[PDB]
Amino acid sequence: DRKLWAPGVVAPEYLKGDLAGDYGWDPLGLGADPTALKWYRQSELQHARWAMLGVAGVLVQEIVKPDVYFYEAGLPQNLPEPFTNINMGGLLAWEFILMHWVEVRRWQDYKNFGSVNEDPIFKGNKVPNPEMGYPGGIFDPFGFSKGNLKELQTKEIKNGRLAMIAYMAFILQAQATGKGPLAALSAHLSNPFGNNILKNIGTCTVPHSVDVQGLTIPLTCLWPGSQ
Amino acid sequence: AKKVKIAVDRNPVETSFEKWAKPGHFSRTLSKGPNTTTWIWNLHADAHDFDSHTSDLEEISRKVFSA
Amino acid sequence: VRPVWFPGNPPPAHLDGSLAGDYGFDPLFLGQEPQTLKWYVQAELVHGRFAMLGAAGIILTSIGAKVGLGFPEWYDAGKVVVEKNNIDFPTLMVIQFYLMGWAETKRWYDFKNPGSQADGSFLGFTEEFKGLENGYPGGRFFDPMGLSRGDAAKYQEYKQKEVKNGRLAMIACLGFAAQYAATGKGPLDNLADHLADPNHVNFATNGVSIPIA
Amino acid sequence: VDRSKDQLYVGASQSSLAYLDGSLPGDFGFDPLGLLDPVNSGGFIEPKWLQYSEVIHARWAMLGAAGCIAPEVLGAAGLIPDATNIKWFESGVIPPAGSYNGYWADPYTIFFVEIVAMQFAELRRLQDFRYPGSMGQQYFLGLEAIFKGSGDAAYPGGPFFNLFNLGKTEAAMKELKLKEIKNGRLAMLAMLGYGAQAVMTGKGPFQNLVEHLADPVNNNILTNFAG
Amino acid sequence: GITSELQLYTTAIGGLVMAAAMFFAGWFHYHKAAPKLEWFQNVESMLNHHLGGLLGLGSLAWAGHQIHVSLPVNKLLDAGVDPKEIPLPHDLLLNRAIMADLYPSFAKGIAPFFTLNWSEYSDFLTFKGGLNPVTGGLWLSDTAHHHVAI
Amino acid sequence: MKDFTTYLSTAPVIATIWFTFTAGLLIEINRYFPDPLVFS
Ligand code: CHL
Ligand code: CLA
Ligand code: CLA
Ligand code: CLA
Ligand code: CLA
Ligand code: CLA
Ligand SMILES: CC(/C=C/C=C(C)/C=C/[C@@]12O[C@]1(C)C[C@@H](O)CC2(C)C)=C\C=C\C=C(C)\C=C\C=C(C)\C=C\[C@@]12O[C@]1(C)C[C@@H](O)CC2(C)C
């Protein structure tokens, strides 16, 4: 009885509202294999949660530091004063080691549900992990999981899906116009007709490559825009 | 007033090398194989004499068309 | 049931999926006869195994050339090795055919009469040359780690892995030859050019592969 | 061929009414050469292939008819840069007539991607005609769920090719198929018109229309024999 | 109008493709879709297609080649132009300006054909007779009018 | 394939291969040892 993505369209058999934010949308039928549907559901949570942090970071960073131009914020010379011109090789080493640990733990949970709940060092500590992708426990200090969990999952995925669309709008707008999200919004308001996608779509403002501390990094736009 | 139209038969014959290994298959006389050297000459002499292999005009015409 | 090279086409009768890497690909029915199929199964493995050694050797030496360690390109190594080391080519060629001839004749008469080379005739060795299957010698000489004598399920998995990397290597060795003829540069020299400008540097623009271009 | 709608067209004959019983879409009885006669049919001249081929020609022609004029109409309205306001036969398909420099790759590099992409699209479509339902069985990254067909080769249906499941009722589907065939047949004649008009006049389809409206008497096929 | 070994080479490749098509047709029309006896006995239909279709359109198609390829190329060859400097046959086809220089009648397009002013084409549809003095062979303009009439 | 190899075993096919081989051997010998008149 739930509303579907389009009017008068039959939902797939395997989509029966069990998961949150289920509109019965699967034109490519990628969820037919039950095991594949679980894996894709996790990746939807990862993209949804990472994307929401991405959108929040870009917007908040723009307000505090308007001139950083987040697209270029990755360059070492643009880093804050404490970290300015830090050796990117050492900086990457922290991320690889720390993310490899965290992500393998999450991966092992998917392979064998409930195996990696307990802390490895300090015996006794554990997380409830009521459902895969929702560890809870220490990950939910405020205890919002208690109550109408189903509704909260719906709110999370719906906002997360919107963030995914919104963030890729930031990327394409930066590539085409060369301005951040808020800056582009101001430009449209000033001259709604002269300054819009109909004009900017044909230009890609990203240089072909950059030199990061002597290492050349290729760059591209998402379409063959006029460099 | 028989109408002029395209008329064919589907898969009349099978594509196999079986008969390539049985010389004389086309003729009843030569199908039994050789006993004298006269058989060898008879094989080549009557190979394209379709009208004598079969009495069916349709079968004769189809061989002529593809030959 | 099992996947095939051309989806929707039933596999040939003589290919029942028992062999490793079987996708029912035999459009010319070259292996219809069961005894001839044994010969080609082993011919494919020998071709595949040599190609893997060839591809790995060509790739590794090419990396040595690009990095500047001084290795010559695969298409010049033969001339360089002989001249630099002062080797008589006809003697080296003859030695190869004695060693290959002895080793490869033994493989020939094991195919004809399986188990014949494990009779103790050759220096008293009676179990290292018995053979496990067609194209899979086994034993403690050809399989010192005993990966074919351990788990049966995983050994069948490796047979699938061996043939597919062998077929991939065979295609690669054809790529090395075709690329050298069209371009006249080393393997990784071509790879570097493609990564520079993939759009404007490939076979469609080399001026050879597509003459009408 | 009677224009417009009617029970039967000009070329309808008593011989063709023997097997043309209205079952097929757009069945107006027009078959003077009697190529659709079921009796003693074979090869490619059979009802199933000829009806299938017409729909395939209809759908390619519809894309071609709209795509061979849109650059001129959009360019005339200023919605695209003048650099891309190019006649359909001067895009690069016929380099002797004219070629466009500015694609992200050489037109032969683009063609190879076209070959590979169309090999998959066309050979998979063919295998459903030879073995109905066979493309929904072998693993294809989970996409085989949407390639199960519907028994009729020309109308696969399914979750993707019938994304919005229009024509749910039998009566509705027949009307849609009829509308598809008539638009498709009209586009096939339009494409032939583009080809003939290009040779006779050497100008784009849009230019020919504008010139005809200017001076209809002084601009038509008869006056274009000489210039 | 052949002037290079490339043109000879392409015809040979086309000849092999036709040879492959002919052998496929023989296999197809014997093992796959064999015409029935009633099909072979439409003598009226066969003559119609072989008179107007084989001989008729074959003669018209060859007239198209002579009018657009053979006549311009041989007109320049007889004038002494170096073969490598002659325009390619497709340049003659695409550029009506070039053809007008050799034969002014082309400046009027195909309007004379449809308006029945066939005398406009007298410059390349001739009735000279005799032999071309430079090459000792029949005029190709005469040969083109022959195949158009045929 | 059994029948096809049987066809290649027919007398005309064998003779063509055999004489093609025999002729090729003689032609190649005279290519590397031109003008042989005496054993020497
Ligand atoms: C009548 C003569 C005769 C002939 C024609 C052969 C022929 C053959 N025997 Mg042999 N045998 C013969 C008698 C005998 N064989 C054997 C026992 C065997 C066995 C057990 C085997 C053969 C095998 C073979 C084959 C080896 C193929 C090859 O490439 O070898 C290449 C040859 C060599 C590598 C050795 C010769 C190299 C070189 C000419 C001499 C070099 C000498 C120097 C000292 C080298 C020093 C180098 C160091 C210092 C680096 C070949 C068909 C083998 C085979 O293929 O079996 C299936 C095999 O396994 N024979 C005995 C003892 C009963 C014989 C008695 O008369
Ligand atoms: C079928 C669609 C189509 C195709 C195949 C092309 C192809 C091309 N366009 Mg054109 N273009 C189109 C439609 C299309 N365009 C439309 C509708 C517009 C108006 C928004 C433009 C505006 C435009 C500009 C301003 C420029 C090009 C240029 C180009 C070239 C590629 C480089 C580039 O920057 O493209 C960028 C173009 C796009 C990303 C348009 C994508 C259109 C998609 C494929 C169709 C669906 C669009 C959809 C209805 C949404 C429209 C906008 C929306 C706000 C309503 C290439 C020849 C460049 C050129 O001339 O180089 C010499 C160039 O500078 N196009
Ligand atoms: C002597 C020549 C000849 C004849 C009399 C026939 C006769 C027949 N063929 Mg066969 N065929 C031939 C040659 C011939 N074929 C060749 C050479 C090939 C290989 C290419 C085939 C391949 C073939 C197939 C695959 C099929 C037939 C079929 C048929 C039947 C219907 C034909 C029809 O209506 O065509 C009408 C023609 C068309 C619908 C196509 C017209 C356009 C074609 C593709 C090109 C014509 C080019 C033109 C002559 C020159 C253009 C000049 C310039 C503009 C470039 C009929 C029994 C069909 C059958 O069995 O039906 C029961 C069938 O399925 N033929
Ligand atoms: C059979 C159909 C067909 C074909 C073969 C062509 C072919 C062509 N068209 Mg035409 N066109 C057609 C139909 C067709 N058109 C139709 C129906 C219309 C009306 C809508 C148009 C409107 C049109 C315009 C307005 C223009 C062309 C142009 C072109 C040329 C350049 C094509 C190009 O750059 O594509 C670009 C390639 C793509 C759009 C495909 C992108 C493929 C990537 C991999 C997709 C990635 C997707 C991404 C990951 C996820 C989705 C993102 C999205 C939500 C934003 C080329 C000759 C251009 C031209 O003539 O330039 C000189 C041009 O300006 N066409
Ligand atoms: C590989 C494909 C193939 C296969 C397996 C078959 C199989 C068969 N065909 Mg079919 N056929 C094919 C292709 C094939 N055909 C083609 C391409 C055509 C078109 C020409 C035909 C036309 C055809 C006809 C008309 C007939 C068959 C018949 C047969 C049967 C016996 C054929 C036989 O004995 O051949 C063995 C014969 C040969 C090997 C001779 C080959 C002759 C070719 C044309 C080469 C000519 C070379 C020429 C002489 C060179 C000059 C010589 C000089 C230098 C000395 C058998 C079922 C017959 C049948 O079913 O009878 C009941 C039959 O009547 N076929
Ligand atoms: C069969 C023989 C033949 C052929 C093929 C041609 C062909 C041609 N002649 Mg020639 N001609 C011939 C006989 C022939 N002629 C004869 C016998 C005479 C003596 C009376 C002449 C006298 C003559 C003169 C005086 C002239 C020509 C000219 C021409 C050219 C333009 C004709 C024109 O305006 O067409 C108008 C339109 C058409 C023919 C219709 C074209 C239809 C197209 C091909 C449809 C394509 C549809 C398709 C779906 C679209 C592609 C889609 C795809 C890319 C996706 C053309 C190359 C003219 C020229 O330019 O000469 C250099 C010219 O001035 N001819
Ligand atoms: C993860 C993500 C973004 C993450 C961004 C991050 C971390 C950004 C970080 C930083 O920016 C900051 C904060 C500050 C900067 O200074 C530095 C960087 C480092 C740049 C986006 C995902 C974005 C993901 C997107 C847009 C995915 C869209 C998927 C769609 C539409 C799929 C549709 C369908 O598949 C279904 C569901 C079902 C099928 O049946 C049908 C089809 C149609 C195939």
UniProtKB/TrEMBL annotation, chain A:
<feature type="binding site">
    <location>
        <position position="200"/>
    </location>
    <ligand>
        <name>chlorophyll a 28</name>
    </ligand>
</feature>
<feature type="binding site">
    <location>
        <position position="24"/>
    </location>
    <ligand>
        <name>chlorophyll a 3</name>
    </ligand>
</feature>
<feature type="binding site">
    <location>
        <position position="105"/>
    </location>
    <ligand>
        <name>chlorophyll b 4</name>
    </ligand>
</feature>
<feature type="binding site">
    <location>
        <position position="111"/>
    </location>
    <ligand>
        <name>chlorophyll a 4</name>
    </ligand>
</feature>
<feature type="binding site">
    <location>
        <position position="44"/>
    </location>
    <ligand>
        <name>chlorophyll a 3</name>
    </ligand>
</feature>
<feature type="binding site">
    <location>
        <position position="105"/>
    </location>
    <ligand>
        <name>chlorophyll a 15</name>
    </ligand>
</feature>
<feature type="binding site">
    <location>
        <position position="25"/>
    </location>
    <ligand>
        <name>chlorophyll a 2</name>
    </ligand>
</feature>
<feature type="binding site">
    <location>
        <position position="46"/>
    </location>
    <ligand>
        <name>chlorophyll a 8</name>
    </ligand>
</feature>
<keyword id="KW-0150">Chloroplast</keyword>
<keyword id="KW-0793">Thylakoid</keyword>
<feature type="binding site">
    <location>
        <position position="173"/>
    </location>
    <ligand>
        <name>chlorophyll a 1</name>
    </ligand>
</feature>
<feature type="binding site">
    <location>
        <position position="107"/>
    </location>
    <ligand>
        <name>chlorophyll a 4</name>
    </ligand>
</feature>
<feature type="binding site">
    <location>
        <position position="119"/>
    </location>
    <ligand>
        <name>chlorophyll b 3</name>
    </ligand>
</feature>
<keyword id="KW-0934">Plastid</keyword>
<feature type="binding site">
    <location>
        <position position="47"/>
    </location>
    <ligand>
        <name>chlorophyll a 10</name>
    </ligand>
</feature>
<feature type="disulfide bond">
    <location>
        <begin position="204"/>
        <end position="221"/>
    </location>
</feature>
<feature type="binding site">
    <location>
        <position position="173"/>
    </location>
    <ligand>
        <name>chlorophyll a 28</name>
    </ligand>
</feature>
<keyword id="KW-0603">Photosystem I</keyword>
<feature type="binding site">
    <location>
        <position position="136"/>
    </location>
    <ligand>
        <name>chlorophyll a 11</name>
    </ligand>
</feature>
<feature type="binding site">
    <location>
        <position position="25"/>
    </location>
    <ligand>
        <name>chlorophyll a 1</name>
    </ligand>
</feature>
<feature type="binding site">
    <location>
        <position position="159"/>
    </location>
    <ligand>
        <name>chlorophyll a 26</name>
    </ligand>
</feature>
<feature type="binding site">
    <location>
        <position position="105"/>
    </location>
    <ligand>
        <name>chlorophyll b 1</name>
    </ligand>
</feature>
From TrEMBL, chain C:
<feature type="binding site">
    <location>
        <position position="26"/>
    </location>
    <ligand>
        <name>all-trans-violaxanthin</name>
    </ligand>
</feature>
<feature type="binding site">
    <location>
        <position position="107"/>
    </location>
    <ligand>
        <name>chlorophyll a 8</name>
    </ligand>
</feature>
<feature type="binding site">
    <location>
        <position position="74"/>
    </location>
    <ligand>
        <name>all-trans-violaxanthin</name>
    </ligand>
</feature>
<feature type="binding site">
    <location>
        <position position="138"/>
    </location>
    <ligand>
        <name>chlorophyll a 10</name>
    </ligand>
</feature>
<feature type="binding site">
    <location>
        <position position="167"/>
    </location>
    <ligand>
        <name>chlorophyll a 1</name>
    </ligand>
</feature>
<dbReference type="GO" id="GO:0009535">
    <property type="term" value="C:chloroplast thylakoid membrane"/>
</dbReference>
<feature type="binding site">
    <location>
        <position position="179"/>
    </location>
    <ligand>
        <name>chlorophyll a 1</name>
    </ligand>
</feature>
<feature type="binding site">
    <location>
        <position position="104"/>
    </location>
    <ligand>
        <name>chlorophyll a 6</name>
    </ligand>
</feature>
<feature type="binding site">
    <location>
        <position position="206"/>
    </location>
    <ligand>
        <name>chlorophyll a 16</name>
    </ligand>
</feature>
<feature type="binding site">
    <location>
        <position position="28"/>
    </location>
    <ligand>
        <name>all-trans-violaxanthin</name>
    </ligand>
</feature>
<feature type="binding site">
    <location>
        <position position="47"/>
    </location>
    <ligand>
        <name>chlorophyll a 5</name>
    </ligand>
</feature>
<dbReference type="InterPro" id="IPR001344">
    <property type="entry name" value="Chloro_AB-bd_pln"/>
</dbReference>
<keyword id="KW-0157">Chromophore</keyword>
<feature type="binding site">
    <location>
        <position position="203"/>
    </location>
    <ligand>
        <name>chlorophyll a 19</name>
    </ligand>
</feature>
<feature type="binding site">
    <location>
        <position position="23"/>
    </location>
    <ligand>
        <name>chlorophyll a 2</name>
    </ligand>
</feature>
<feature type="binding site">
    <location>
        <position position="161"/>
    </location>
    <ligand>
        <name>chlorophyll a 13</name>
    </ligand>
</feature>
<feature type="binding site">
    <location>
        <position position="165"/>
    </location>
    <ligand>
        <name>chlorophyll a 15</name>
    </ligand>
</feature>
<feature type="binding site">
    <location>
        <position position="39"/>
    </location>
    <ligand>
        <name>chlorophyll a 4</name>
    </ligand>
</feature>
<feature type="binding site">
    <location>
        <position position="25"/>
    </location>
    <ligand>
        <name>chlorophyll a 2</name>
    </ligand>
</feature>
<feature type="binding site">
    <location>
        <position position="24"/>
    </location>
    <ligand>
        <name>chlorophyll a 3</name>
    </ligand>
</feature>
<feature type="binding site">
    <location>
        <position position="203"/>
    </location>
    <ligand>
        <name>chlorophyll a 16</name>
    </ligand>
</feature>
<protein>
    <recommendedName>
        <fullName>Chlorophyll a-b binding protein, chloroplastic</fullName>
    </recommendedName>
</protein>
